[PDB]
Structures are given as C-alpha cells and as structure tokens.
Design a protein around this ligand. Structure first.
Ligand SMILES: *SCCCCCC(=O)NO
Ligand SMILES: [Zn+2]
Length: 414
C-alpha cells in the first residue's frame, strides 16, 4: 500500500505529515499540505504560488487563450472539494502502485533525490535550497522530490513547475510541482481516424485519470533525473494533414513520454545525441562526488549521501571509493526512464481504452468524481468488475456510464 494513511482534509495538523508549509524563496502564505509517502506531498490548493506570473485564477484576455483550455475560478475553493481532491489523488497513486510498472516508476521517483549541487567549493557537497519545503511551527526545512498541486488558472493545463544550472536537463534533478486534478478528464474517440481529425467526434470515451497522472509522473521522472529533452527540440508534424495545416509542433519530450509508435518519430541520430549528452552529465556528477570531502549541514553523513547518488544514478564504485559511470548501467537506467516508463505501456498494465497516439485532437473535458467506490476503484478504474461496466470498457463509455461524466466544454471544431 503506497499511501498508508487515509487522510481527511480536516485532519489536524501534526507538523510531520500534515502541516502548513511554504516554498523557499517565494508573497505566499502557508498552505495546508499532506505527506502521502516518503518524498511525496499533496497540496489541495489551486496553484497561485509557484509562478509569480500566475497569481490570479481568472481567465487571461481571450486573445491570449489556447483552444484546448478551460477556466473555472471557483474550482477547489471549498473544504469538501479539497477533501475529495486529496482522496482522489491518493486513490490514483494507489491505482498506479497496484501495477508492476507503476511500482517501478514510483520507486524510481522516490530514489530520484535532486542532486546536492549547491556548493560553490569543490571539496563540499551541499543541498540546493529550492529542493526543500519549509514546514511551519518557527520552521524546519525538509527535502522532497514531488508535490501534486491543484491547477492554476487554466484547469486542464497540467504543467510541471520547478526552481533552478538547468536542473531538469543537466542530470541533477529538482523537486517537481505537478499541476493536476483528479476531478476532470478528457474525452477521446475510439476510431483512430476520428480521434486524429479536428472536425469529428464528441469524445465518447473518457480517459482514465490514472493514465493522465502516470503520464505526468513519467515527465517528473525525467525531470528528477535531469534528463528531460529541451522543449524547443520538436517534431514538426508531417504525419497528420491537420497538424500540418495548423503547424502543430510537438516536443520530443512528449513523444518519448507517450512511447509506442510516437517515439519512433525521434530519429536515431538525435536520440543518440540526447543519450550522449546525458551520459556526459552523469559523468560530471560522478566527478563532483569524487571531489567532495565534506558535507554541509546536519541531516546526513557524507558517505550516506554519496551512496544515495550512487544508487540513484547507478554509479560504479572502485576499491578506492571513487565513482564512475559504466555505459552499460547508464544505458539501462536511461532506457528504463525513457522507454519502459511510457503512457503506452501503462495502458497495457491498466487494461483501459486510451488514445493511441499523442498526435490526436482533444474532443471534450468532463467533470468526474472518482472518490466513491460505486464510481471508480483502485483495481478497475471506471470499469467496475461484476457490473455492466466491466466489459468492453463500458465504464469509460460516457454514453453508457453517463451518470459518471458531465461534459463541460467541447473542443471539436475550435
Ligand atoms: S510534467 C512536464 C510538463 C507537462 C505538460 C502537460 C503534459 O504533459 N501534456 O502532455
Ligand atoms: Zn506530456
């Protein structure tokens, strides 16, 4: 069991795993937060904190808005919504952990401690302060890897924010703040030709939000190991005439995260270039660890932190105590994080209906309520065993299971 406490939003603060917290630096008032697992926290609040550019929840000027956007400044403003948000997110982590692939991914994420690259002197290993949160009581700072937070103004923009050396792309990693909601999901079409056409389909089938969360956690895995691909390296889509009409550009990072046939649109040569780039980053980390002869702070010993990063990066260690990067082990970890952890593989483990490509067109956004077990379960999602929803993905079929879905906006035609 991944989350061994059944938190309620109104549970009293204890300063340990239910607490008021602040983000170092950041303006922000303390927010009630919940530690659901080692290194992983949930803040059931709309994100007005991580980006100074984004404090308001009202829509920007309409000329500013993308077509696939959805605003509702009232969402997640009440205690009952935050209770259901917290319970919904924990339920989705348990659904992910109930699969072997999700257990692997979540183990990688917990082991993926952001590197202690904060020192200005080679002989000292030091934390980077923005990979911590401040737990209020006086305050005490504590390292963490992942925070799930409510969305900012655009509810369906599930961006990842972090503070930063380009930490998500230099091998170091940084604490990831994932904007996410378990209370909404997207509709897609069961025919591929319809799903990849911007003019057709109303969104008959609903994405299982466990797949959406797993998709975001895959990105967070890349980012915590500092191997995310530069967002400006993109596929200028020439396989979908409507992508080419609209000139839609999709980053290699997305195509990698979806996996399946999409990842083959990254050419072998540019993939080798990324692989060599990140291999060299891991070598620099080994070199940094070898120069460090003392540790800064009171939380852990030098030899404990060297071993934490040996385990994170799969470093080899010679009989003199010196670390190095073995290409066979680097390739195994890199492939694990980039080719084994993919959306397409999660669909296989969950046995759900899902989009077949990232290169489609979104159809609709639905309100959902996955907290009741009569609606959704850790092991079956919407497709509840021993009911009329168990077969043929009937629980994801928004026409059969219509009481579980409220369509809020249509995107077809926009
Ligand atoms: S977690 C990295 C940014 C995620 C942006 C939303 C997304 O994953 N869309 O496919
Ligand atoms: Zn993505």
């Amino acid at each position: 069991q991944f989350v061994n406490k059944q938190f309620n939003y109104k549970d009293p603060v204890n300063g340990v795993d239910i607490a008021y917290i602040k983000i170092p630096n950041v303006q922000m008032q303390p927010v009630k937060a919940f530690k659901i697992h080692n290194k992983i926290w949930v803040i059931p609040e709309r994100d007005t904190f991580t980006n100074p550019e984004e404090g308001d929840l009202n829509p920007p000027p309409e000329a500013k808005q993308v077509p696939v956007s959805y605003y509702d400044s009232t969402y997640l403003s009440t205690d009952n919504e935050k209770d259901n948000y917290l319970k919904g997110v924990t339920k989705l982590f348990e659904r992910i952990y109930s699969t072997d692939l999700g257990r692997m991914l979540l183990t990688s994420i917990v082991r993926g401690i952001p590197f202690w690259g904060g020192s200005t002197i080679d002989t000292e290993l030091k934390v980077i302060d923005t990979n911590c949160i401040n737990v209020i009581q006086s305050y005490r700072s504590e390292e963490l890897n992942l925070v799930i937070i409510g969305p900012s103004a655009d509810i369906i923009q599930f961006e990842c924010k972090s503070f930063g050396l380009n930490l998500t792309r230099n091998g170091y990693g940084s604490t990831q703040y994932i904007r996410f909601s378990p209370d909404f999901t997207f509709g897609f079409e069961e025919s591929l030709e319809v799903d990849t056409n911007p003019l057709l389909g109303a969104g008959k089938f609903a994405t299982d939000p466990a797949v959406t969360l797993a998709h975001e956690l895959i990105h967070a895995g890349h980012r915590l190991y500092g191997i995310a691909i530069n967002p400006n390296r993109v596929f200028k889509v020439n396989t979908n005439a409507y992508y080419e009409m609209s000139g839609l550009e999709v980053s290699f990072e997305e195509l990698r995260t979806f996996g399946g046939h999409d990842a083959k649109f990254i050419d072998s040569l540019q993939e080798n270039e990324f692989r060599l780039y990140y291999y060299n980053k891991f070598k620099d980390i080994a070199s940094t660890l070898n120069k460090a002869k003392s540790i800064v702070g009171t939380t852990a010993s030098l030899q404990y932190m060297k071993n934490v990063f040996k385990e994170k990066y799969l470093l080899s260690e010679d009989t003199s105590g010196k670390f190095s990067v073995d290409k066979l082990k680097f390739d195994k970890l890199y492939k694990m994080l980039t080719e084994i952890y993919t959306e397409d593989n999660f669909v296989k483990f969950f046995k759900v209906l899902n989009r077949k490509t990232y290169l489609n067109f979104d159809k609709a956004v639905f309100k959902i309520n996955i907290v009741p077990k009569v609606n959704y379960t850790i092991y079956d999602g919407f497709n509840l065993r021993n009911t009329n929803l168990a077969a043929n993905f009937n629980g994801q079929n928004t026409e059969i299971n219509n009481m579980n879905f409220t369509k809020l906006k249509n995107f077809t035609g926009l």
